Amino acid sequence: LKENLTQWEYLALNSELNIADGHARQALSPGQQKIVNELPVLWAESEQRPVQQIESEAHQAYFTLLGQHGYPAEPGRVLSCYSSSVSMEILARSLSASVDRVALVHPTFDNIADLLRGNGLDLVPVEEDALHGADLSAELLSSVGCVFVTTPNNPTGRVLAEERLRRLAEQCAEHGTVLALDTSFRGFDAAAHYDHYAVLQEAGCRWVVIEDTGKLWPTLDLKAGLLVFSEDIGLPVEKIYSDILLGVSPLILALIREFSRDAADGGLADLHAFILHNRSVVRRALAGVEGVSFPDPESRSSVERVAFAGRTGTEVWEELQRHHVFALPCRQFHWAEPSDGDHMVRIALSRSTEPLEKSVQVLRTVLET
Amino acid sequence: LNIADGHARQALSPGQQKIVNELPVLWAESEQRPVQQIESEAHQAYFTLLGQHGYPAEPGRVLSCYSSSVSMEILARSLSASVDRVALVHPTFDNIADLLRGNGLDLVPVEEDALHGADLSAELLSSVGCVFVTTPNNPTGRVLAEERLRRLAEQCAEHGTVLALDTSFRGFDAAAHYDHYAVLQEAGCRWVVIEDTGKLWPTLDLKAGLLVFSEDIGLPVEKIYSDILLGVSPLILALIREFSRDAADGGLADLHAFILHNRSVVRRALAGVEGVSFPDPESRSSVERVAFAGRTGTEVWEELQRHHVFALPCRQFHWAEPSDGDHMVRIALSRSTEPLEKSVQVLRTVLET
Ligand SMILES: N=C(N)NC[C@@H](O)CC(=O)C(=O)O
Ligand SMILES: [Cl-]
């Protein structure tokens, strides 16, 4: 009855022990609270300055924070959207104008697949081992109009390394294929902070990148998706963007600018240490629980998969919920073969440590019948 | 300056500035309380402010979207599997036509005098899967009266047709504050209403579209909504709640007087100019059409742009027959009175030369 992962996440939104959706819900740091305290000043700034200047500063702050120095800074090359999923809707409807089939990393966050399928795109799954480990086949590339990679991936944290991004972009250029990247989790893993735009521009393929500010910081879902495209993208992303929105709030762009600057001043290192700490409490709690393992030992992302022998993630979820703890079954990240995720759940790490600790102690008991 | 887009850009009232000064408190509330409570309170405040007492208050029946256009994208995509043709009021907000067409729907225009003045024909209704009405209409301000909404809903029920309403301008016109949901539920057609908080108040485009649907809508609106978002920011919902409460305490009356004053400024400025008329004398909406014989709205737009004034030509609103609008421009009234007056003074000079 839960048609997708988001519908599993609705069930948790109002619970104290929500460890389901991946949004950031931990406490603000002192530096971030200082930003919140200045919201009336930022409001006045947003009333008084041209939105284009605030937007340009927000983009410069966010891209540079995360190593993306070669981003196209000319006005109009970065389209600020209400969310990364709104960017994805724009991209999907734009692709449907000239593309029939898309190669998509599998597993990945399921709304990517659902927005593409919903706009009439046929999907070809590419497992992570194939994507990272070998060139894509000429047969595949000649059969799709777009290759779509989430990096760092959600839910696995796997990062597309620079040498493979380079080869994939060269392959897409050689075939005339669009290379599309979803980089929502970029800020969590320094392995993703090499300059992706330099790689894409050097290879000269058609490309689109959807950045997302929303997952990094606890901003009450005040965020933007940033839809960045090559000059030769040859899809109607600008026209469809303008059918959906004029732009995002200057106050949100001002907030992104300020949170990005705080992150550059030491906040990002603190965030990495916080996520590492919370990952450690999860793994320590589910330590010698017979049948438990962690499929992504090297992940640095803000979500964590846990596997179990002998039960399904749906059953674990239901016993958890009877204790008012809400996690996420993994089936639906495996959008081409949901049974691949039948023995995993996903835990959200962007949470205050104390309710996270409480939730995984409950999971430890459940997982011990 | 900008008298083009319809968004609210006037200064905050003192009551609204107090809300903004307390944003850090609203932030703490949004961290601490269940979003569902904040959302229910925001919906209750907004629907009750505007007379919509019968709205479905059960959680999940009102879907909070980033914007009304996001709601419209959801609706357009949701229609596309089962509906080939949509009857759409003409003229209207051109984004609605472009979102419907972009999702594969063919459009049939319904002129305003036909929509308001008589029942729709069986031929039309049996040939479309959805009838879409913007009320109060943008750009004309024309309000669908209760008796006509009831008949239109009854006719859509009789023909198995979805009735969809876009009510973004609702807050500006008390004629649109009769309870639309009571009518829709009593008629028993499949229906969707897209409310919008965005155009009423100068909130720096912090807003929500509210996608409301009948239990039997029979379209994948909930599924496609969940493909796009988990929900809107609790801070924005809290802001909507507070601005709605301020409006209920006298702010809405002040807004109506402010819009009336700015409408009066525009008309007094242009009253005597040869060839100028106002096609919508009873409109209370936050945009104003100005008609003028002798020039095209495109030519007038061009001339204003030379003097650094940005209005809108009306062609685009006549999405089925753009020439229907090339003797009109549209002026935005949700502006501080001083820059509006400056803009209209340039327009008067342009029209007198
Ligand atoms: N359809 C959408 N947009 N769902 C919300 C999204 O933020 C969930 C997600 O990606 C996660 O929990 O990791
Ligand atoms: Cl408008």
Automatic annotation (TrEMBL), chain B:
Keyword field: Aminotransferase, Metal-binding, Pyridoxal phosphate, Transferase
Annotated Mg(2+) 1 binding sites: D94
Keyword tRNA processing belongs to the record: no
A GO BP annotation: amino acid metabolic process
Requisite cofactors: pyridoxal 5'-phosphate
Gene Ontology molecular function: metal ion binding; pyridoxal phosphate binding; transaminase activity
Domain (Aminotransferase class I/classII large): residue spans on this chain: 41-345
Cross-referenced CDD domains: AAT_like
Amino acids binding Mg(2+) 2: D94, D98
InterPro entries linked: Aminotransferase_I/II_large, AspAT/PAT-like, Endura_MppP, PyrdxlP-dep_Trfase, PyrdxlP-dep_Trfase_major, PyrdxlP-dep_Trfase_small
Domain of life: Bacteria
Family affiliation: Belongs to the class-I pyridoxal-phosphate-dependent aminotransferase family.
Protein name per the record: Class I and II aminotransferase
Species: Streptomyces wadayamensis
